[PDB]
Design a binder for this molecule. Structure first.
Ligand SMILES: *[C@@H]1O[C@H](CO)[C@@H](O[C@@H]2O[C@H](CO)[C@@H](O[C@@H]3O[C@H](CO[C@H]4O[C@H](CO)[C@@H](O)[C@H](O)[C@@H]4O)[C@@H](O)[C@H](O[C@H]4O[C@H](CO[C@@H]5O[C@H](CO)[C@@H](O)[C@H](O)[C@@H]5O)[C@@H](O)[C@H](O)[C@@H]4O)[C@@H]3O)[C@H](O)[C@H]2NC(C)=O)[C@H](O)[C@H]1NC(C)=O
Ligand SMILES: O=C(N[C@@H](Cc1ccccc1)P(=O)(O)C[C@@H](Cc1cc(-c2ccccc2)no1)C(=O)N[C@@H](Cc1ccc(O)cc1)C(=O)O)OCc1ccccc1
Ligand SMILES: *[C@@H]1O[C@H](CO)[C@@H](O)[C@H](O)[C@H]1NC(C)=O
Ligand SMILES: *[C@@H]1O[C@H](CO)[C@@H](O)[C@H](O)[C@H]1NC(C)=O
Ligand SMILES: [Zn+2]
Length: 596
């Protein structure tokens, strides 16, 4: 159609206008997250309401263009993106109420403080860093159960009524966009109507390995705490797993390591000894990206980022985040950085988001986002996989006197699995839970025990104390309180191994027939070949359906669990044999810790 001329001019101006309007909303959201006050809350929400009103007008104006009739797939793709209003489809008053509900939940989470286990006078312990410090380090099971209960009562139960209204308005918004529910609204980002089934299939392939790891960990925990604390046949008490949500278990590696007399990589002490700071950690992340011929952090990043928890009295959101301001080179991180191994990896994860921002900033506004949400989460994790290798850690002087024999290799593979395999059922359940509420599949009388039932069924973990429908535990996880879709992380954990394997081959760092080049010791630091693949993919933003973006990276078009299974194959062989040798019980009875 000749109208395509025009349409192209229309999109040109509109994209530029959206970027500028979104810059303004983003600044107000940054100010609030950096400094939680009633005044900043009001300002964030009023500017969002303003932009929502404009979006309503945009979606309306698309109907004046015959865009479905156009020759250009590119023009059609842009118009389609503009018709998708999300929450902005809601009536003015409903949108304002939703924004008020969202900030009530996020500020509740950020403001949680508990009393010291040993000093009921001292009541200023926050999750980050005080409570997380205990959960990751204490081996006093009663102390752990105390902090678990205090946190969940305050971050979870306290916001049930707000969470209920959020579900209602989220559903109403989805239906105004003609999605069945918000589950379908979220899934739309993956542009694939078999996406859920694809993930069920990949998950089913990896589940048996998870069950072997679970069995071995439970066996080792029984030896440490005794059978009064940990049963052989039941779900693992979750507070013993070194993470408030039991989402990753690497913090208890020193008590569950396959070979306790051989080295286990933990560089936190060496980081401190060498005088590492948050600034140094970010500079090192920047170095990694630039070493691969990727983009250096701009001056705005250094000038405007927050890389340490503020020491004034203020309330803020400490959960780490990366921010795109939709201009040129105005990108920032807010991280309450600590000097630990886990935090070094976290820094690289966040800088992965920043790199993606810089790579696609020349794209039209609607294309300035990930190919799918899993792509955005994957970027930094691919580098963190290299950072975590004995190979890399020796290069930067953090790992000393390391002998990489067969036993040390198993220890390192197991340590990696405690993050990478353990996470998979966890991440699947965060969205299976919310989807089921969104879809109206669970009665409100059953909402809490529906959460714990999924945690049991998929992860084989349970609360430390008996819960019931008088509690409401799901919002005790940040993303649930903050209305952040979680499937992105499951997709990320699968595809990051496809990216890592390919980048390692391109770097000459992995050859399956060369004993000297194992995938689990690959360091892509300094590889321009690996960097080129990233540039080819990331610079696309969301200009093409995601299989096109994967193709740009390594010639493949299919999400596949083959690469993650390849990485862990030596661990699988060893672990299956070890569990047989030690008569380790696999599987678990149904939990008794959530009362109907
Ligand atoms: C989610 O799904 C919803 C449906 O469940 C959908 O809502 C529908 O959107 C339609 C707009 O696309 C709308 O259709 C219009 O209907 C008008 C009259 O409807 C009235 O009576 C209904 C009861 O019978 C009531 O329920 C309504 O509230 C209304 O009061 C028509 O007058 C109108 O017509 C005009 O527009 C067409 C479209 O023209 C198109 O564009 C060009 C013109 O430049 C054409 O050449 C082209 O071929 C194309 O057809 C013209 O053909 C016509 O001449 C008129 O100008 C129109 O048909 C419908 O009413 C509405 N609701 C329902 C219940 O059907 C939502 O839009 C969906 N939401 C999202 C976000 O996608
Ligand atoms: O800033 C975010 N997202 C942050 C969350 C967020 C989302 C919306 C609004 C505010 C905040 P995060 O996931 O970086 C924040 C990160 C923080 C983090 C990272 C690591 C880490 C540990 C070891 C190795 C590697 C990483 N542990 O915590 C996050 O949540 N992670 C998930 C889980 C996780 C992910 C990866 C991983 O490797 C380990 C765990 C969680 O905390 O539950 O997104 C920016 C963006 C993405 C896409 C488009 C536009 C902008
Ligand atoms: C936080 O916001 C308040 C008022 O909303 C403002 O007075 C103050 O300057 C801000 N605090 C900091 C540390 O920036
Ligand atoms: C670095 O990236 C640029 C971007 O095109 C490329 O032209 C150059 O060849 C790359 N350098 C190397 C050594 O590959
Ligand atoms: Zn992230």
């Amino acid at each position: 159609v000749k109208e395509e001329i025009q349409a192209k001019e229309y999109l040109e101006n509109l994209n530029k206008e959206l970027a500028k309007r979104t810059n303004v909303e983003t600044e107000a959201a940054w100010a609030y997250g950096s400094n939680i006050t009633d005044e900043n809350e009001k300002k964030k929400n009023e500017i969002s309401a303003e932009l929502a009103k404009f979006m309503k007008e945009v979606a309306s104006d698309t109907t004046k263009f015959q865009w479905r009739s156009y020759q250009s797939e590119d023009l059609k793709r842009q118009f389609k993106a503009l018709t998708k209003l999300g929450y902005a489809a809601l009536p003015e008053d409903d949108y304002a109420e939703l924004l008020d509900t969202l900030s009530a939940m996020e500020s509740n989470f950020a403001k949680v403080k508990v009393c010291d286990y040993k000093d009921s006078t001292k009541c200023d312990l926050a999750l980050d860093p005080e409570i997380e410090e205990v959960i990751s380090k204490s081996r006093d099971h009663e102390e752990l159960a105390y902090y678990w209960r205090e946190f969940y009562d305050k971050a979870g139960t306290a916001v049930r009524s707000q969470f209920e209204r959020y579900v209602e308005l989220n559903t109403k918004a989805a239906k105004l966009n003609n999605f069945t529910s918000g589950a379908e609204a979220w899934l739309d980002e993956y542009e694939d109507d078999t996406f859920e089934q694809q993930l069920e299939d990949i998950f089913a392939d990896i589940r048996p390995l998870y069950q072997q790891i679970h069995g071995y960990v439970r066996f080792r925990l029984r030896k440490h705490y005794g059978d009064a604390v940990v049963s052989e046949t039941g779900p693992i008490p979750m507070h013993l797993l070194g993470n408030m949500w039991a989402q990753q278990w690497s913090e208890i590696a020193d008590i569950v390591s396959p070979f306790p007399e051989k080295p286990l990589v933990d560089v936190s002490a060496e980081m401190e000894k060498q005088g590492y700071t948050p600034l140094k950690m970010f500079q090192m992340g920047d170095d990694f990206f630039t070493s691969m011929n990727l983009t250096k952090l701009p001056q705005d990043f250094w000038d405007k980022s927050i890389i340490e928890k503020p020491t004034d009295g203020r309330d803020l959101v400490c959960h780490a985040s990366a921010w795109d301001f939709y201009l040129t080179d105005d990108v920032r991180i807010k991280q309450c950085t600590r000097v630990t191994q886990d935090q070094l990896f976290t820094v690289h994860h966040e800088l992965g988001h920043i790199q993606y921002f810089l790579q696609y900033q020349h794209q039209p506004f609607v294309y300035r986002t990930g190919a799918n949400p899993g792509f955005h989460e994957a970027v930094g994790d691919v580098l963190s996989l290299s950072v975590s290798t004995p190979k890399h850690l020796e290069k930067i002087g953090l790992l000393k006197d390391y002998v990489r024999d067969d036993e040390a290799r198993i220890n390192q593979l197991f340590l990696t699995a405690l993050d990478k395999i353990v996470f998979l059922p966890f991440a699947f359940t965060m969205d299976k839970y919310r989807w089921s509420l969104f879809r109206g599949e669970v009665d409100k009388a059953n909402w809490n025990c529906a959460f714990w039932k999924l945690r049991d069924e998929y992860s084989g973990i349970e609360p430390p104390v008996v819960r019931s429908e008088k509690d409401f535990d799901a919002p005790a996880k940040y993303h649930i309180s903050a209305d952040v879709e979680y499937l992105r992380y499951l997709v990320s954990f699968i595809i990051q191994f496809q990216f890592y394997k390919s980048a390692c081959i391109k770097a000459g760092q992995y050859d399956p027939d060369n004993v000297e080049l194992p995938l689990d010791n690959c360091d892509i630091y300094g590889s321009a070949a690996a960097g080129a693949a990233f540039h080819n993919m990331l610079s696309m933003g969301a200009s093409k359906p995601w299989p096109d973006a994967l193709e740009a990276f390594n010639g493949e078009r299919i999400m596949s669990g083959k690469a993650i299974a390849e990485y862990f194959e030596p661990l699988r062989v060893w672990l299956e044999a070890e569990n047989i040798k030690n008569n380790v019980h696999i599987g678990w009875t149904t939990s008794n810790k959530c009362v109907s």
